[PDB]
Amino acid sequence: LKHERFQSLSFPHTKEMMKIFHKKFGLHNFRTNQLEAINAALLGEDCFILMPTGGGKSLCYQLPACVSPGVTVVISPLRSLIVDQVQKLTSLDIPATYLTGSEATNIYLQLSKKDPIIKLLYVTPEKICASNRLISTLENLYERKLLARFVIDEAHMLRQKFPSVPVMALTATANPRVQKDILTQLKILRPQVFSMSFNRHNLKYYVLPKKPKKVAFDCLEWIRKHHPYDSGIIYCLSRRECDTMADTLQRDGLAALAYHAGLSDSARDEVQQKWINQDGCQVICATIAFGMGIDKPDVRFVIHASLPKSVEGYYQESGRAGRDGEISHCLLFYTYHDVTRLKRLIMMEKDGNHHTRETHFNNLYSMVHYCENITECRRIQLLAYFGENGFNPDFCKKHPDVSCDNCCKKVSQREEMVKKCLGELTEVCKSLGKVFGVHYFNIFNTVTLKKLAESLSSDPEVLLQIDGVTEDKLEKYGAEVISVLQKYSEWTS
Ligand SMILES: Nc1ncnc2c1ncn2[C@@H]1O[C@H](COP(=O)(O)OP(=O)(O)O)[C@@H](O)[C@H]1O
Ligand SMILES: [Ca+2]
Ligand SMILES: [Ca+2]
Ligand SMILES: [Mg+2]
Ligand SMILES: [Mg+2]
Ligand SMILES: [Zn+2]
């Protein structure tokens, strides 16, 4: 009943909320739970949002941040999230900045002005639990009624100084024990809880037989056939496996780079920037901690070249594929020889007891159960592991384009022009990204670029009807994008 009122478009804030949604974000339709969480936030409620990767958590706090006077402070332990969101917001001409760790002094000075201007201020938990200058800046905003909200983006002491400021916590963790632990911490606030299925609608799950001395050649062949020009990740069990996987792909002309703790800080920074920008690196061959630290929205494939340690690890590692919502593939190469490799690592782990080993073995038991279960829908298997009941077993049958492997068991001239145009528009976004200091997908994302190419239009009134196209973006990037589209005028209709 409280949640049905959160579906209303008749609040005092609705007109401004919808104006900013359409004109500043360039959007047209809300996704599951977005309108409800946004309305609860603008009504002053504390919120807890449980939403999988790709669901659209960012808009849940960024759109209320734009509507409200003053500053929304966003706490996040993920540096990749902070950099991505500040680039995204800056590209949209939404004032935003971060404090993670002289440049801080300029931010504190701007926040103290009559008009702080900054709408979203991103900070790390370490920065907000140590910087006394940040605390007094927040005190100054609070006294002028310009401290709008505290957000924790990926929620996996401060309420005493600012008790009237609402809190919004968001998480993509499917672990129900972690979800309940976060809710326990927020319980005194009596937050509105918005939950939904953790099913990743756009991911295709596969489990393939692994040849222990030939998996690199199978990766190379699959990538050339399905995603020759798209980014991907190959997760490996060890640093040496990363290096041999990258070596093998490099010897065959595929731009692959190993990404792990063995690299120097200089080499890590170079591999990260080449892969994020599609600049001389198509695939990163990574250990789990390293692959989970980079936030690219258009990862078209995640391949697990060896067995993951747990289903929770598998879901969260494969799950970062396709944050843009476009179809992506999640291939797990399975051999029981990798179970033995993992058991040896478990037995040799330093400071390990029968309990830590038992925990690791129990995690391995469930991962192998998924690999050996060749009948039940893989979407159902993943959600059953996390205790999510009520998932439609017919999902893969209803959407065969994203069917898991267990449920599985012509080009026109105008479309050729659409593909050529899309290629030129992506190249334009890469050159614009260098000029504006953002990654190409923060000039225009995958879906916006795909729809711009499909239109083949150079009319701003048509282009402004596409999701993600905004008047502020056409003022900054429009001459370049429209110059490309103009060349396709014979094919528009
Ligand atoms: N209502 C919407 N309509 C269209 N695109 C949207 C909408 N909400 C979010 N998006 C886009 O979907 C993508 C994924 O959103 P994001 O906030 O990164 O998801 P999450 O943080 O939940 O993984 C982004 O490119 C974002 O701009
Ligand atoms: Ca958004
Ligand atoms: Ca289920
Ligand atoms: Mg996010
Ligand atoms: Mg409350
Ligand atoms: Zn299925």
Residue numbers in the entry: 639 to 739, 744 to 798, 816 to 1068, 1207 to 1290
Text from the published report:
RECQ helicases catalyse the unwinding of duplex DNA with 3’ to 5’ directionality, driven by energy liberated by ATP-hydrolysis. RECQ-helicases are strongly implicated in the maintenance of genomic integrity, principally through their participation in the homologous recombination (HR) pathway for repair of DNA double-strand breaks and restart of collapsed or blocked replication forks, but also have roles in toleration of microsatellite instability and sister chromatid decatenation. Loss of function of WRN underlies the complex progeria Werner Syndrome; defects in BLM underlie Bloom Syndrome, which is characterised by growth retardation and immunodeficiency; and defects in RECQ4 are associated with Rothmund-Thompson syndrome, which displays growth retardation, skeletal abnormalities and premature ageing. We created the expression construct BLM-HDΔWHD to remove the conformationally flexible Winged Helix domain (WH) that requires the presence of either a stabilising nanobody, or interaction with a large DNA substrate to facilitate crystallogenesis replacing it with a short poly-(glycine/serine) linker that serves to connect the Zinc-binding domain (Zinc) directly to the Helicase and RNAse C-terminal domain (HRDC).
The aromatic-rich loop (ARL) is a highly conserved motif in RecQ helicases that serves as a molecular ‘sensor’, detecting binding of single-stranded DNA and coupling it to structural rearrangements that enable ATP hydrolysis. In our high-resolution structure of BLM-HDΔWHD, the ARL is disordered and is not visible in electron-density maps. In their paper describing the crystal structure of BLM in complex with DNA, Newman et al. observe that the HRDC domain packs against a shallow cleft formed between the D1 and D2 domains of the helicase core, with the interface between the different modules being highly polar in nature. In our high-resolution crystal structure of BLM-HDΔWHD, we observe the same ‘parked’ interaction for the HRDC, even in the absence of the WHD, but in our liganded structure we see that the HRDC domain swings across the face of the core helicase fold to make a series of polar interactions with the ssDNA-15mer, which is presented on the surface of the D1 domain of a second protomer within the asymmetric unit.
